[PDB]
């Protein structure tokens, strides 16, 4: 009773929250006449999250049904490849947005040419193109496979240990483990630069009672929350993937844990719009 009722509920809540947040952000950005590089990055991230969440139910429903796939063969491959492409696009968008933010905040004069609106749009388009072509292996192996008891499943045509190891390493690295060091380094560098500037400017700010530079943590809170949400949403899934790399005949508890990690994998795509709407620096007035 609990398994078939309570657990599916969170999927719907996450899907609805992500849909509403992404739609609101996209509408606000498109409607707004003034669009800047941060706005372009936020809109691209919102679109990627919207597409990623839209495809989520088509894959999650298989787990809820117990393994049965109802959308047929070709749709299985289509949905799997598009979901992997959306994952890659979201990861790349996060990484490039963090890099651009670091360059803008820490090194304003170092990379002016590539931070232009025109080149920003071109970089986003190239990022989407790269993400789409990085999912080509998924098209090859994503197939519907029959299993005992006659259920059958949206599965991969990977059985040898070497091939599954290669695929798991490629997917996990490109999605979470290559982006994460870059994002963390960018955040730490931004924090250190802000702290250094705060300390250096004390001479021209501490003479008389005035604004104490608004401290350093509060004005970097959004990036920290982004990093925390990304970690909490991706790490469990990507660590369970590595754990499953050495595993035969998975147990019921491991299956439930894997399903929960899959459900939690889409949490960031829905949290991020709330981060940009509520936690942002009074961005609601642009609605």
């Amino acid at each position: 009773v609990v398994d078939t009722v309570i657990l599916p509920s969170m999927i719907g809540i996450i899907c609805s929250t992500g849909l509403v947040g992404n739609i609101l952000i996209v509408f606000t950005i498109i409607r707004s006449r003034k669009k800047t590089v941060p706005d372009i990055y936020i809109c691209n991230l919102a679109v990627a999250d919207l597409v990623h969440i839209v495809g989520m139910p088509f894959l999650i429903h298989q787990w809820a049904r117990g393994g049965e796939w109802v959308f047929g063969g070709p749709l299985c491959t289509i949905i799997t490849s598009l979901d992997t492409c959306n994952q890659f696009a979201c990861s790349a968008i996060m990484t490039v947005m963090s890099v651009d933010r670091y360059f803008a905040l820490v090194q304003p004069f170092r990379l002016t040419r590539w931070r232009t609106r025109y080149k920003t749009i071109r970089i986003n388009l190239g990022l989407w193109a790269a993400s789409f072509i990085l999912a080509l292996p998924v098209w090859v192996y994503s197939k519907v496979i029959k299993f005992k008891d006659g259920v059958e499943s949206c599965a991969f045509d990977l059985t040898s240990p070497d091939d599954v190891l290669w695929y798991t390493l490629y997917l996990t690295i490109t999605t979470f483990f290559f982006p994460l060091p870059l994002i963390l380094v960018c955040y730490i560098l931004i924090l250190c630069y802000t702290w250094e500037m705060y300390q250096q400017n004390k001479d021209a700010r501490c003479c008389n009672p005035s604004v104490p530079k608004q401290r350093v943590m509060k004005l970097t809170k959004m990036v920290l929350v982004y990093v925390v949400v990304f970690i909490l949403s991706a790490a469990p899934y990507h660590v369970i993937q590595l754990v499953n790399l050495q595993m035969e005949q998975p147990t019921l508890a491991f299956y439930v844990g894997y399903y929960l990690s899959i459900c939690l994998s889409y949490a960031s795509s829905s949290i991020n719009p709330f981060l940009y709407i509520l936690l942002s620096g009074n961005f609601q007035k642009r609605l």
Binding site: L59, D83, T84, F147, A155, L158, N244, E248, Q249
Partner: peptide
């Protein structure tokens, strides 16, 4: 009985 790999199942490896 089914293995898991990237949001979808995998055939179990035997021996």
């Amino acid at each position: 009985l089914r293995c898991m790999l990237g949001r979808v199942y995998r055939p179990c490896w035997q021996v």
